[PDB]
Design an enzyme around this catalytic site. Sequence first.
Site, PDB file in Angstrom:
ATOM      1  N   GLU A 214       0.840  -1.189   0.000  1.00 35.12           N
ATOM      2  CA  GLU A 214       0.000   0.000   0.000  1.00 35.12           C
ATOM      3  C   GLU A 214       0.878   1.243   0.000  1.00 35.12           C
ATOM      4  O   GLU A 214       1.963   1.259   0.583  1.00 35.12           O
ATOM      5  CB  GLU A 214      -0.954   0.009   1.200  1.00 35.12           C
ATOM      6  CG  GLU A 214      -0.317   0.246   2.548  1.00 35.12           C
ATOM      7  CD  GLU A 214      -1.333   0.141   3.673  1.00 35.12           C
ATOM      8  OE1 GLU A 214      -1.859  -0.971   3.898  1.00 35.12           O
ATOM      9  OE2 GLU A 214      -1.615   1.168   4.326  1.00 35.12           O
TER      10      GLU A 214
ATOM     11  N   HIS B 117       7.030   0.756  12.381  1.00 30.14           N
ATOM     12  CA  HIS B 117       5.887   0.990  11.508  1.00 30.14           C
ATOM     13  C   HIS B 117       5.876   2.423  10.991  1.00 30.14           C
ATOM     14  O   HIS B 117       6.021   2.597   9.764  1.00 30.14           O
ATOM     15  CB  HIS B 117       4.585   0.691  12.258  1.00 30.14           C
ATOM     16  CG  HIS B 117       3.355   0.808  11.412  1.00 30.14           C
ATOM     17  ND1 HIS B 117       2.094   0.539  11.896  1.00 30.14           N
ATOM     18  CD2 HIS B 117       3.192   1.165  10.115  1.00 30.14           C
ATOM     19  CE1 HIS B 117       1.206   0.725  10.935  1.00 30.14           C
ATOM     20  NE2 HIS B 117       1.847   1.105   9.844  1.00 30.14           N
TER      21      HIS B 117
END
Length: 83
Positions: free
Chosen positions: A46, A83
């Site tokens: 993504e 992340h």
Amino acid sequence: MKLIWSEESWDDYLYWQETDKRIVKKINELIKDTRRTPFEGKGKPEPLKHNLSGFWSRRITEEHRLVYAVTDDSLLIAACRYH
């Protein structure tokens, strides 16, 4: 396709080599899949935004993500930890 690591991402990778071989193999698997289909496949690729626009992200684990960018002939790894 040239594989390019930043000082930071290579550090991430070395960390996994001395922390969890399973993660190293997952990252390798993701790199291999990305080489094949840059924006499709494993880790559910993504697009990232703003400061990281142009970069994409795949899931290594629910916490760690493989962040990368692709050009005409190179795969740039920005990170493979956090992340």
